[PDB]
Amino acid sequence: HGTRPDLTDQPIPDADYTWYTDGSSFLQEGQRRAGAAVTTETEVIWARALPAGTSAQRAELIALTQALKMAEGKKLNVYTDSRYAFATAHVHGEIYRRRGLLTSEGREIKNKNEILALLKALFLPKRLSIIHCPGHQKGNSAEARGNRMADQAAREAAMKAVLET
């Protein structure tokens, strides 16, 4: 009946998982390729190539949603460099849903199905923080490294799918 009341935008100290997500989308070999990833600072938890023509923004929602599903029952800090996915998760998604805009034939809202899946996935972690950090950071901080890891993994997945066919 609504969205997740305890969803926070700052890291929680006691988290089981601190994960970084990224979606990427680019033209490779005459086609729009996309990838989505979930990583720690140092290791890839999950990464996938997504369907041809997937946008960066859709990929970012898909990565975030996957982090939520994987962290079911656990305390999760997840980072995203997408203002779009951050805002969708925290604010826009639930408004669009309550207005009936997600299940409508209106194509005025992009990524309707991913947003609905994200909204459902928000309830899975025991505790949840979805944190925005600027991407493509030159910083040496953990978050800068986690985001570069996630960007790398997402891009690697999309590219690997291309050359594996």
| 3-state secondary structure string across the chain | CCCCCCCECCCCCCCCEEEEEEEEEEECCCCEEEEEEEECCCCEEEEEEECCCCCHHHHHHHHHHHHHHHCECCEEEEEECCHHHHHHHHHHHHHHHHCCCCCCCCCCCCCHHHHHHHHHHCCCECEEEEEECCCCCCCCCHHHHHHHHHHHHHHHHHHHHHHCC
Q: Judge whether 156 is annotated as a binding position.
A: no
Q: Judge whether 31 is annotated as a binding position.
A: no
Judging by DSSP bridges, how do beta strands 127-132 and 17-27 pair with one another?
A: unpaired
Determination approach: X-ray
Judging by DSSP bridges, how do beta strands 17-27 and 32-39 pair with one another?
A: antiparallel
Q: Judge whether 10 is annotated as a binding position.
A: no
Q: Judge whether 151 is annotated as a binding position.
A: yes
Q: Judge whether 55 is annotated as a binding position.
A: yes
Among the listed residues 87, 97, 135, 151, the one whose alpha carbon sits nearest the alpha carbon of residue 119: 97
Among the listed residues 71, 50, 72, the one whose alpha carbon sits nearest the alpha carbon of residue 61: 50
Data resolution in angstroms: 1.9
Q: Judge whether 25 is annotated as a binding position.
A: yes
Q: Judge whether 41 is annotated as a binding position.
A: no
CATH of domain 1-165: 3.30.420.10
* Gap between the Cα atoms of 8 and 70, Å rounded: 18
* Gap between the Cα atoms of 68 and 127, Å rounded: 10
Phi, psi angle pair for 63, to nearest 5°: -55, -50
Q: Judge whether 16 is annotated as a binding position.
A: no
Among the listed residues 23, 133, 126, 15, the one whose alpha carbon sits nearest the alpha carbon of residue 77: 15
Q: Judge whether 60 is annotated as a binding position.
A: yes
Q: Judge whether 27 is annotated as a binding position.
A: yes
